[PDB]
Amino acid sequence: IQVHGIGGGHKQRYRMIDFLRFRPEHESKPGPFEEKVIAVRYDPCRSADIALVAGGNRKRWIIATENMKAGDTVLNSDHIGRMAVAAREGDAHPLGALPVGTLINNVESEPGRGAQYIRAAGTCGVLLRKVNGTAIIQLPSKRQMQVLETCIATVGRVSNVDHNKRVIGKAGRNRWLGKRPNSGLWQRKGGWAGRKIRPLPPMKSYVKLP
Amino acid sequence: AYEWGVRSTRKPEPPPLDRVYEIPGLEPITYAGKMHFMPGLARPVFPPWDPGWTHPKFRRLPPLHEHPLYKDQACYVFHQRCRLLEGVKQALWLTKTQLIEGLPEKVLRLADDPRNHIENQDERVLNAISHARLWHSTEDIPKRETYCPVIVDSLIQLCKSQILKHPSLARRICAQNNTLSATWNRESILLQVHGSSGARLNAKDPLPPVASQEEVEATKNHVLETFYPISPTMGLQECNVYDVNDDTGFQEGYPYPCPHTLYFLESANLRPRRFQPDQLRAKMILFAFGSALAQARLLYGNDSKVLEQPVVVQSVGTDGRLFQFLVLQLNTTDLASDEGVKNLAWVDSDQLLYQHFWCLPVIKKKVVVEPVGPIGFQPETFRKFLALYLHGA
Amino acid sequence: GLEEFFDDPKNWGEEKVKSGASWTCQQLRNKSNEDLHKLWYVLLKERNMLLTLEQEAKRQRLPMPSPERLEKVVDSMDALDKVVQEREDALRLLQTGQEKARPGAWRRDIFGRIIWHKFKQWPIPWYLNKKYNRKRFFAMPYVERFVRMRIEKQARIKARKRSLERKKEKFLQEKFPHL
Amino acid sequence: KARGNEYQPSNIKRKHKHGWVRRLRTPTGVQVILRRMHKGRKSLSH
Amino acid sequence: FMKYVVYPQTFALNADNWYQSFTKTVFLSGLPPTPAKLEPEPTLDITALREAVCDCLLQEHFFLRRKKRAPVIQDREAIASPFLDQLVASLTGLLSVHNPVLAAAALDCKRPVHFFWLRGEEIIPRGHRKGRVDALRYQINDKPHNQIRISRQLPEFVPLDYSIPIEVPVMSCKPDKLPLFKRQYENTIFIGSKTADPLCYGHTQFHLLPDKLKREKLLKQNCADQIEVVFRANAIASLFAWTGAQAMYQGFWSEADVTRPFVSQGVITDGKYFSFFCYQLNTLALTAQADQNNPRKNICWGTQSKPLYETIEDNNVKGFNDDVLLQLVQFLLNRPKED
Amino acid sequence: GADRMSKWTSKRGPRTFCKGRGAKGTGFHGRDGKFVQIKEMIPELVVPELAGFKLKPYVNYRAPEGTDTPLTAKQLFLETAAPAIEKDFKAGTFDPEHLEKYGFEPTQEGKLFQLYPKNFPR
RNA sequence: CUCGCACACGCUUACAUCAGUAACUAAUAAUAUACUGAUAAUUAACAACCAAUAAACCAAAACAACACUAAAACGUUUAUUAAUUACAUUGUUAACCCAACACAGGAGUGCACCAAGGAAAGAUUAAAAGAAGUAAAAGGAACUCGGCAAACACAAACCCCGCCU
RNA sequence: ACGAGCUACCCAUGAGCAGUUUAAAAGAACCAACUCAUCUAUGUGGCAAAAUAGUGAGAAGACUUGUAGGUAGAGGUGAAAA
RNA sequence: ACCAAAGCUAGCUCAACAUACUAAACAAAUACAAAAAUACACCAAAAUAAAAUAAAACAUUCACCUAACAUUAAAGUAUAGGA
Ligand SMILES: [Mg+2]
Ligand SMILES: [Mg+2]
Ligand SMILES: [Mg+2]
Ligand SMILES: [Mg+2]
Ligand SMILES: [Mg+2]
Ligand SMILES: [Mg+2]
Ligand SMILES: [Mg+2]
Ligand SMILES: [Mg+2]
Ligand SMILES: [Mg+2]
Ligand SMILES: [Mg+2]
Ligand SMILES: [Mg+2]
Ligand SMILES: [Mg+2]
Ligand SMILES: [Mg+2]
Ligand SMILES: [Mg+2]
Ligand SMILES: [Mg+2]
Ligand SMILES: [Mg+2]
Ligand SMILES: [Mg+2]
Ligand SMILES: [Mg+2]
Ligand SMILES: [Mg+2]
Ligand SMILES: [Mg+2]
Ligand SMILES: [Mg+2]
Ligand SMILES: [Mg+2]
Ligand SMILES: [Mg+2]
Ligand SMILES: [Mg+2]
Ligand SMILES: [Mg+2]
Ligand SMILES: [Mg+2]
Ligand SMILES: [Mg+2]
Ligand SMILES: [Mg+2]
Ligand SMILES: [Mg+2]
Ligand SMILES: [Mg+2]
Ligand SMILES: [Mg+2]
Ligand SMILES: [Mg+2]
Ligand SMILES: [Mg+2]
Ligand SMILES: [Mg+2]
Ligand SMILES: [Mg+2]
Ligand SMILES: [Mg+2]
Ligand SMILES: [Mg+2]
Ligand SMILES: [Mg+2]
């Protein structure tokens, strides 16, 4: 046992979730593409709700935005523009092409790495400013992230917004989700407890300055 | 990107070579002479193994390009278990027909005629429903792979009993698990339907054309529905090995040359194993077109042209409770162009033959509220099935 | 042809059954190889009959009539197997010169002992065999103490055996002073 | 409850825990076998 | 309780005699005596029936192409099974115009038939029940290839108290020496449907021989009369089990005996060879307490095995036996009595 | 605690444990899950005809034995190969390079029944 | 009086026939499934052993029509090559296993409440004390730490502490 | 060194819950199989190194339970009783 | 008078000499769950000895404690030690 209080849950299948929003089928046409959303389903692995997205000859399970419904049209692109883009709720665009007050989700860290941050249900970051070809966003933990402007991000808030307001009726529901009860040992609080007022940590930057 | 392999679950890389092998002009001393492992000696490097006489079972699998029928053009093959997403839309697109909601007026006239019915129609069909769902098995709850071919074969026996009044049903025969191949080109990509069917009805005589020339001419200016983000390829299987030869399951000189009805069975317990109804319709469209194209190229030749004599193939898709009916008329071979004459397809969708069945009597508050047997009955489904069987005569 | 498992019916109820001597090795060496091949089956049918009669005598609680016939027959089988083995290993000493019919190696196993490991027939080589590489033919450094202790134990056993024989010689010489 | 029946027999568990192969996969089990051979045991393992 | 599992398709050496001992049935070679009160019914056209049978032969032997068979041994089970379904369906369709009962009859395809009965007595040799008396129980788990079921009973061939001088062979050995083995599971008596099905009577059975019981396999096993014995045992097991199933869905059992006899027909086929059998059940009281004063017996009439075709090759049927087809048509033309 | 001194046998274990008693395999598992037996692995028993052959399993008591001389490689050479070698050397036709005419074989793998691999069972 | 029949696991001939028991085993005899000796036995169809490589697959089992949340075990067809050729090997007994014992304990699954399994009393007498059961005049908690146990009752309320399962 | 065949907790793979009340398979209610052991009486070298009889609590779930694997003592495991 | 008692042997113990040291049996099967002829592999590894004791406690220390160098003396000497 390395992590306590995990086990005895319901049987769950895992859905293969594609994190890279811009993934062309073939390298013959590297242009922006447009796909169609078929259905939005519940996923037991994460708090979010996923959507099946089909285009070309393949389907991917992606993380759904707030109002993605059955039979929708979603545009994925890498094209950065000086007239920017008019952002809808489905589109995936690089951070350099988005307007200043844009709410975003599934934020890519390194260009080509894939989406890592802002994945939980109802959580959305916000773009702050774009200076010297570099994007700065604000995370759901209110921390500033400095990223290259060519990283692809999806505009909007993750679906199932009322996941925070979801009430658990009993301990049986916790055992259904798989959370074992806490230990009965009474531990006196140390100095770590208490209301710690700390200043905000500085901006975390992944742009490598030569 | 996020690669889907795991470093632990993947096969390990080979251990790094001993530093003796990096010395030029030095013979390594290994444990290969004693034919077992020994600590302190270098690991020997053996050449790849060459079994001079070949064994069939224990050899490595030959590559796909080694096969004689391998071709560079990737053909898209449809078999029994392939699923189509926009099933009716993909079926209409890859088949180049036009969808019609009702069955033909000849079929409705054949069904609604009171002289074409059996002696006690409702009694025999309700007894067939009860026989398939409850009576035919020792168990109290028979499974769907048991009761679906039973209800199909029972309906075939019920419409086969009409041969004494109509002595033209003896020109037919049933066939099983045949090899079907039909390859064509549809807008710069190569399609092929290939596989088998459940049960296929053939006859000596062809089926007469069912659509009027006014319908054929009004089909000409019909535009096919298009769908942008999904390609019409999607759902088929990419294959680099195939043969460009239309292969029906029957060889030359067969006494029963023209198929009259296909029968499609969904025999599975679980919901994800069975087809969705749109996928089932798509499967009957493309298989019935495969049989019709096999007919219209065997009787005419490899040249692509419009048909002065249409080819009519019918099919019934069965879940065991809910039926789908198809009459497909083939008129056109040259599917490379999108502007020519389109073929026709009449589809009755989701004909419910019964609502629900109770195998055991349900008891609420110590009394029987619903008796044993099927709840709800629609004889129009049987009437359409009987018309589809009796369409030859 | 199922009666060959039994004797002739005249000999069924007789208490004593006389028979000849067993086949001698020098008498086996004078015969040809086809003669030995036929004599093997001639002896085989008689041995099957004798084993059947032995089992029936055990079943019906009566003594077997002269059971030395089976001993003479199995002596003849040992003699014929022996002379065939002389012909085969002599001929192999002329052709190849290898002393043993089966290939083998003197090996050091994990237990520290010296073992004559006989080889087996495999369709695949030794480095590619899944079952064979997990076998270990070597001794670890901790095995040497147990190897030494095995040596020490057998040395003590032969020491006591030698002293025992010396004591018995002394006791007999003191018991009977005929010298 | 009542005790004395902690041994519930199973040949799979017996040959997997105290088997010859399980003894020889580990050097400590190998040394166990050498100690039993030095003592002169009739049965080295299960 | 414990019971013997009786297999209709068996590899036993003398299985027909042991099945006759378990069944109290007497076997008579030759056809049953013909009910010669028939109206002038044979206006049959032989050419169309021969053409249909030859078309079925040419389809599952030459015309219908399989997925490619890499063992190349061409197993006769997959070859002759849809041959039998097509033969039964085509002959029923062509003979429905002469026999209207076949139109109202139902067709079953590979649906099991079960029967359970008690026969004789036994003293238990071993165990804690040693020395006590417990009856011998038998179970037949049979899977016929094809079946025809009729709302009304087929007529009798011989009367109920009809006596034959030949008597039931009694083996002076335990049933384990056949070999047969005792096994315990649920006791089912099955007709091919449940009780609420209105068709509680039948017409014919069809039985395909498996791969292990082929004539070539028997000649490799050095087995001459076993060709006839296997067909005999298959008929004696299957038809008796199914007539007992008819009798016990009709309410007759051990202490009710049988009021009027149960008559059945059977066709047992190897891939080239056909055999025809008839069965009449009079006895259902096979219990030893009711079998002391029971004079009546069951009868099984048999036909020697006869091939239908010969050396089929390249869309031409070389040899053909018309008499097998005539016997099959006479079997399929039997009708219940009318009033 | 079971029986350690008893031999481990297929009679002792569960339905999973199935161990042979020492017989030789005669086939493999085929396509349908059944067993396909290979006729080539079947030991074809080699029997002579004993009807026209005169010998008996017992020896006369008055028949004398012999001085036990075991068969030796030197004796086999002196009886079989030595007259041919001596005759060829006295005739001048002896060839040291090629000895195949005298019964010697260089490599065993050409012939059907090898000696050092022991190809024949018995 | 009613823990029966079989299977899985586990035990290892303790099973069956014949003969013996002065003594050894049954916590005692009679004799024998439990001791002794000899001889035999469990026969496969049931069960084990019983192909991979690519690809089309989102759509629960709950009589499943169609739904809920905790998101759900259980396979098809398409292609590539899979030695082709009767009879392979293995388990088939039992009154049985784990508990030092022929121990009122423990022991998984499928159908039954008997059509199957068995015997509370070795033979007397009917003292006290002890355990179990039935019944009781009048009274009905007056007994006791406590209405503990028992009873023709098997109900209605107030608090303390913890919400509750 | 040896131990997770009992037990504490997990990973697989399976199997059970009949009737009754209710729109309910609701960590609802009555009560079996089943799982625990509240109270009393016997038992105290006993049937038993923790049992028997009566009476009790849950009994569609945070439930029992078969097979198999894993965590090993400066430790494992723990709805903390050291 | 029962129960009982008495033997002189099997064999060990300590050394010495001594070749030079894992005996005997290996026909088959043996590290599949050992004693089961037969299929595409992976194989392998080391890191100081500690403490019970004595110092009347116990912390630095505590001879021998599974590392061949023997005997007569120097010598229980010089030295090392909460000296
Ligand atoms: Mg999770
Ligand atoms: Mg979720
Ligand atoms: Mg908490
Ligand atoms: Mg707490
Ligand atoms: Mg113990
Ligand atoms: Mg033990
Ligand atoms: Mg076993
Ligand atoms: Mg077993
Ligand atoms: Mg076989
Ligand atoms: Mg025991
Ligand atoms: Mg006694
Ligand atoms: Mg048994
Ligand atoms: Mg008494
Ligand atoms: Mg008293
Ligand atoms: Mg009292
Ligand atoms: Mg009372
Ligand atoms: Mg009173
Ligand atoms: Mg008071
Ligand atoms: Mg009370
Ligand atoms: Mg009260
Ligand atoms: Mg009260
Ligand atoms: Mg509480
Ligand atoms: Mg374990
Ligand atoms: Mg465990
Ligand atoms: Mg319930
Ligand atoms: Mg509840
Ligand atoms: Mg409650
Ligand atoms: Mg507890
Ligand atoms: Mg109790
Ligand atoms: Mg009481
Ligand atoms: Mg309760
Ligand atoms: Mg701890
Ligand atoms: Mg505490
Ligand atoms: Mg405390
Ligand atoms: Mg001290
Ligand atoms: Mg101290
Ligand atoms: Mg020390
Ligand atoms: Mg100092």
- Sign of the Cα torsion B207, B213, B215, B221 reads positive
What resolution in angstrom units was achieved for this structure?
A: 3.5
One-character DSSP codes across B167-229: TTGGGEEEEES--EEEEEESSSSEEEEEE--SEEEEESSPPPP-S-HHHHHHHHTPPPP--SS
Residue A25 lies in a domain: yes
User: Is there a single domain that holds both residue A58 and residue A23?
Assistant: yes
Length of chain B: 393
Q: How far apart are CA A98 and CA A92, in angstroms?
A: 10
For residue A171 the two structure tokens come to 């301990």
User: Is there a single domain that holds both residue A101 and residue A73?
Assistant: no
Helix (H) or strand (E) holding A145: strand A144-148
Residues in chain B with CB shorter than 8 Å from the CB of C123 are: 58
Residues 6+ apart with CB under 8 A from E200: E151, E191, E246, E249, E250
Instruction: State the amino acid at position B363 in one-letter form.
Output: I
Residues 6+ apart with CB under 8 A from B163: B169, B170, E93, E96, E97, E103
Beta-carbon count within 10 A of E193 CB: 23
Q: How far apart are CA A93 and CA A97, in angstroms?
A: 7
Long-range contacts for E164-167 (Cβ within 8 Å, ≥24 apart)?
E164/E26, E164/E28, E164/E297, E164/E299, E166/E26, E166/E28, E167/E26
CB-side exposure of F29: number of CA atoms within 13 Å? 2
- Sign of the Cα torsion D20, D24, D30, D32 reads negative
Is B74 at the interface with chain A, CB within 8 A? no
The shortest C-alpha distance from C136 to chain B (Å) reads: 7
User: Is there a single domain that holds both residue A89 and residue A133?
Assistant: yes
- Sign of the Cα torsion E70, E73, E75, E78 reads positive
Q: Which nucleotides of H are covered by protein (CB under 7 A)?
A: 1-6, 9-12, 20-22, 24, 27, 37, 48-51, 61-63, 67-71, 76-81
Q: How far apart are CA E212 and CA E214, in angstroms?
A: 6
CB E307 within 8 A of CB E186: no
F55, F71, F115 ranked by CB distance to C96: nearest: F115
CB A86 within 8 A of CB A155: no
Instruction: Single out the residue of F100, C115, F107, C107 nearest to residue F117, CA to CA.
Output: F107
CA of E211 from ligand 9 middle (Å) equals 10
What is the domain extent for residue D44?
1-46
Residues 6+ apart with CB under 8 A from C60: none
Reduced to 3 states, what is the DSSP secondary structure of residue B287?
Answer: helix
Map chain E to HEC letters.
CCEEEECCCCCCCCHHHHHHHHHCEEEEECCCCCCCCCCCCCCCCHHHHHHHHHHHHHHHHHHCCCCCCCCCCCCHHHHHHHHHHHHHHHHHHHHCCCCCHHHHCEEEECCCEEEEEEEEEEECCCCCCCCCEEEEEEEEEECCCEEEEECCCCCCCCCCCCCCCCCCCCCCCCHHHCCCCEECCCCCCECCCCCCCCCCEEEEEEEECCCCCCHHHHHHCCCCCHHHHHHHHHHHHHHHHHHHHHHHHCCCCCCCCCCCCEEEEEEEECCCEEEEEEEEECCCCCCCCCCCCCCCCEEEEECCCEECEECCECCECCEECHHHHHHHHHHHCCCCCCC
Is A20 at the interface with chain B, CB within 8 A? yes
User: Is there a single domain that holds both residue A67 and residue A42?
Assistant: yes
Residue A48 lies in a domain: yes
Q: How far apart are CA E204 and CA E242, in angstroms?
A: 10
What is the domain extent for residue A126?
78-158
Q: What are phi and psi of B322, to 5 degrees?
A: -140, 125
Is B360 at the interface with chain A, CB within 8 A? no
How far is Cα of residue E266 from the mean position of the Cα atoms in its chain? 4
CB C6 within 8 A of CB C52: yes
**B193: exposed, middle or buried (Cβ count in 10 Å: 0-12, 13-18, 19+):** buried
User: Is there a single domain that holds both residue A87 and residue A116?
Assistant: yes
Instruction: Single out the residue of E5, E3, E262 nearest to residue E120, CA to CA.
Output: E3
Q: How far apart are CA C145 and CA C165, in angstroms?
A: 30
What's the number of domains chain A is made of? Answer: 2
- Could you tell me the CATH number of the domain that includes residue A32? 2.40.50.140
Reduced to 3 states, what is the DSSP secondary structure of residue F43?
Answer: coil
One-character DSSP codes across chain C: --GGGS--GGGTT-S-----BPPPHHHHHTS-HHHHHHHHHHHHHHHHHHHHHHHHHHHTT---S-THHHHHHHHHHHHHHHHHHHHHHHHHHHHT--S-SS-EEEEE-TTS-EEEEE----SS-TTT-HHHHTS--S--TTHHHHHHHHHHHHHHHHHHHHHHHHHHHHHHHHH----
Q: How far apart are CA B117 and CA B130, in angstroms?
A: 20
Residues 6+ apart with CB under 8 A from E1: E134, E137, E184
Neighbours of chain C (3+ CB pairs under 8 A): B, D, F
User: Is there a single domain that holds both residue A64 and residue A117?
Assistant: no
Q: How far apart are CA A3 and CA C74, in angstroms?
A: 73
Residue A187 lies in a domain: no
- Sign of the Cα torsion E159, E163, E169, E175 reads positive
Protein chain B, residues 51-70, with a C-beta closer than 7 Å to any atom of nucleic acid strand G: 56-57, 59, 61-62, 64, 67
C24, C37, C90 ranked by CB distance to F76: nearest: C90
Residue A43 known to bind ligand: yes
Of A35, A54, A77, the one marking the end of a domain is A77
Could you tell me the distance in Å between the CA of residue E128 and the C1' of nucleotide G132? 34
Beta-carbon count within 10 A of C70 CB: 17
> Are D and C close enough to touch, i.e. 3+ CB pairs under 8 angstroms?
yes
Residue with tokens 């006839």: E228
What's the number of domains chain D is made of? Answer: 1
CA of A30 from ligand 17 middle (Å) equals 104
Q: How far apart are CA A77 and CA A23, in angstroms?
A: 10
Instruction: Single out the residue of F54, F61, F102 nearest to residue F80, CA to CA.
Output: F102
User: Is there a single domain that holds both residue A63 and residue A100?
Assistant: no
Beta-carbon count within 10 A of B328 CB: 26
Beta-carbon count within 10 A of F108 CB: 15
For residue B10 the two structure tokens come to 């993947």
Residue with tokens 């398939």: B132
CB C34 within 8 A of CB C87: no
Reduced to 3 states, what is the DSSP secondary structure of residue A86?
Answer: coil
CA of A97 from ligand 3 middle (Å) equals 44
CB F42 within 8 A of CB F23: no
Q: How far apart are CA B294 and CA B245, in angstroms?
A: 10
For residue F48 the two structure tokens come to 């002579």
CB E331 within 8 A of CB E301: no
Could you tell me the distance in Å between the CA of residue C141 and the C1' of nucleotide I81? 39
The shortest C-alpha distance from B328 to chain A (Å) reads: 27
Instruction: State the amino acid at position F46 in one-letter form.
Output: V
Q: How far apart are CA E135 and CA E1, in angstroms?
A: 10
Residue A206 lies in a domain: no
Helix (H) or strand (E) holding F37: strand F35-37
CB A34 within 8 A of CB A75: yes
Tell if the CB–CB gap between F68 and C26 is shorter than 8 Å.
Answer: yes
Reduced to 3 states, what is the DSSP secondary structure of residue A152?
Answer: strand
Residues in chain B with CB shorter than 8 Å from the CB of C128 are: 49
Map D20-32 to HEC letters.
HHHHHCCHHHHHH
Q: How far apart are CA B12 and CA B8, in angstroms?
A: 8
Q: How far apart are CA B294 and CA B184, in angstroms?
A: 11
Residues 6+ apart with CB under 8 A from E31: E276, E278, E301, E303
Instruction: Single out the residue of B197, B221, B116, B128 nearest to residue B162, CA to CA.
Output: B116
Residue A204 lies in a domain: no
Of A39, A57, A77, the one marking the end of a domain is A77
Terminal alpha carbon distance of chain A: 44
Residue A207 lies in a domain: no
CA of A3 from ligand 34 middle (Å) equals 28
CB C138 within 8 A of CB B39: yes
Length of chain A: 210
User: Is there a single domain that holds both residue A20 and residue A60?
Assistant: yes
CB C73 within 8 A of CB C120: no
Residue A199 lies in a domain: no
Instruction: State the amino acid at position B176 in one-letter form.
Output: Q
Instruction: State the amino acid at position B53 in one-letter form.
Output: W
The shortest C-alpha distance from E137 to chain B (Å) reads: 20
Angle between helices E46-58 and E76-95 (to 10 degrees): 150
Terminal alpha carbon distance of chain F: 44
Give the single-character DSSP code of A67: T
User: Is there a single domain that holds both residue A20 and residue A58?
Assistant: yes
Instruction: Single out the residue of A120, E113, A99 nearest to residue A107, CA to CA.
Output: A120
Residue with tokens 């009577």: E201
Q: How far apart are CA B389 and CA B325, in angstroms?
A: 11
Residues in chain C with CB shorter than 8 Å from the CB of B39 are: 138
For residue B238 the two structure tokens come to 């990419």
Q: How far apart are CA A205 and CA E252, in angstroms?
A: 91
For residue F6 the two structure tokens come to 């008893």
Of A77, A107, A125, the one marking the end of a domain is A77
Q: How far apart are CA A153 and CA A134, in angstroms?
A: 14
Terminal alpha carbon distance of chain C: 71
- Sign of the Cα torsion E246, E248, E252, E258 reads positive
How far is Cα of residue F76 from the mean position of the Cα atoms in its chain? 19
For residue E234 the two structure tokens come to 């298959």
Q: How far apart are CA E154 and CA D22, in angstroms?
A: 70
Ligand closest to Cα of A172 equals 26
How far is Cα of residue A128 from the mean position of the Cα atoms in its chain? 18
CB E261 within 8 A of CB E281: yes
Residue F10 known to bind ligand: yes
Residues in chain F with CB shorter than 8 Å from the CB of C69 are: 58
Q: How far apart are CA A89 and CA A73, in angstroms?
A: 10
What residues of chain D have any CB closer than 8 angstroms to a CB in chain C?
Answer: 24, 27, 30-31, 33-35, 37-38
Q: How far apart are CA E183 and CA E3, in angstroms?
A: 6
CB B156 within 8 A of CB B382: no
Q: How far apart are CA E128 and CA C7, in angstroms?
A: 44
Strands (E), chain B: 70-78, 97-100, 172-176, 180-185, 190-195, 199-203, 237-241, 258-265, 306-318, 322-332, 343-352, 354-358, 362-364, 367-370, 373-377
Q: How far apart are CA B94 and CA B225, in angstroms?
A: 11
Q: How far apart are CA B38 and CA B40, in angstroms?
A: 6
Residue A46 known to bind ligand: yes
Q: How far apart are CA A68 and CA A56, in angstroms?
A: 20
Name the experiment that determined this structure. Answer: cryo-EM
Q: What are phi and psi of C81, to 5 degrees?
A: -60, -40
For residue F98 the two structure tokens come to 């090629």
